[model samples]
Target: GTSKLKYVLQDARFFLIKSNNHENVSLAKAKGVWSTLPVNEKKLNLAFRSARSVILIFSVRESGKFQGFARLSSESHHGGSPIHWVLPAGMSAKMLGGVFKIDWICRRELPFTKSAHLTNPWNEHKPVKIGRDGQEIELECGTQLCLLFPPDESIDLYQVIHKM
Candidate 1:
């Protein structure tokens, strides 16, 4: 009898999250709410906001020459990874590995941040044209993922992915 009772008692710590029904709170009410939303929700929110898609963008060699970039996407769906289960459609996922102190998934050619009143139509339609340096880049198949130069450039952006 004591053995059975011991196991049950060992599993009893519990609690529940409470939400209010009277009024909706502003996002500023807390800082962690957005990170708590589900992946699909984050994706929709990110696409709507048109936030800068760079996950970990910085300059090196003091020339404002980017060292490289990290590209992450729920679309990639790598196996046995939590990000595959948790990251939103468009935001960068964080990672750590050799030669990679910190890296984030970078969504290429995404909107470069927008004002609050923009009213996103991206949910229903995607941009038909993307231009850099006065030239339109063809986005088809895997080209959606590529190393960008000029208008926005990162030296050998793609070559460094595996290094991270």
Candidate 2:
């Protein structure tokens, strides 16, 4: 038998953000957009002019410190979602040089995330270099997954990622 599904509407809110910082050109532009937003609003909505680059979101604390950030990628393959995935600023997949060919009979096991295989380009015993910060931190290898940090200083800007 065929049946119909019913749906209901909910409440919504809008905001306007404003900014005046101009130290970093790119960041200034992005902040300019954020600046026009309404104050005290916990959540934000961003609509891009065009789906050309990745969008990075940043947060600040009352003590004039950089709290943290998140990355949003375009979902070209998945049309239903505007964002492909969200990740922390310090976390990433560092790809090693030339790709290696693996034979079917000699395939090696891989660490897996919730939906994909996880691979670290660097030696598990050594520290990994996070792009922004000059300092490097070591990762503990074990069954459970690990996370990384950026730097102690306030980040002046955030950047978009490009794939060649």
Candidate 3:
């Protein structure tokens, strides 16, 4: 369920991602594994000789920028071994949303993506970081959930996500 030991064994590389904005944070996210994203394609076909794992540094974006717990510049980027969960393989690219449903609890109390009562680490180890034209930005709260993804590729790079 949680382990840096559990990593994507094929194309083990950090897929730096910036979640798209939405109702509040004008950000973006992805769906495909390789085709949709063109900007980062040039850094593609990087199947290393050892074939480790792919750690995606996904950060939510807001106001045309990146913001997780605190605030990170739109120009920010991330790179680290995901710590929490690695999406179970064989699941479709669209299956990621299903995992969120189980994580979204207490809807009867408040109306938002509230965290559970246990290890709700906010801003503490902000695994993802950003740099503004070279200046780095960080915070002192809990960090964002780092999830590992397999190196398999049907190449989905779609944009969009909602509380389903």
In terms of lDDT, the best-performing candidate is 3
List where candidate 3 sits over 4 angstroms from the true fold.
3-11, 22-39, 47-50, 63-127, 131-164
- Tens-place lDDT per residue, model 3, 88-141, is 356343332211101111011111133222131232322334321111122111
For candidate 1, what is the TM-score?
A: 0.20
Q: Which should have the higher TM-score, number 2 or number 3?
A: 3
TM-score for each of the candidates: 0.20, 0.18, 0.29
lDDT of 1 by residue, 1-164 (tens): 23322222122211111112111112212211212224333342343233222132222222223222232222222232232213234745443111111222222223223212222122222332211111211222112222231233222334333432
The full ranking of all candidates by TM-score, starting with the best, is: 3, 1, 2
**TM-score, cand. 3:** 0.29
lDDT by residue for model 2 (36-141), tens = 1121211222222232222222212121222222222322111221211122356332211111111011011122222123222333432121112211111221
Where model 1 places Cα greater than 4 Å from the true spot, the runs are 1-36, 40-70, 73-123, 126-154, 158-164
Q: Please state the error at residue 149 of candidate 2 in Å.
A: 10
Model 2 has an lDDT value of: 0.20
The positional error of residue 25 in candidate 2, measured at the CA in angstroms, is: 25
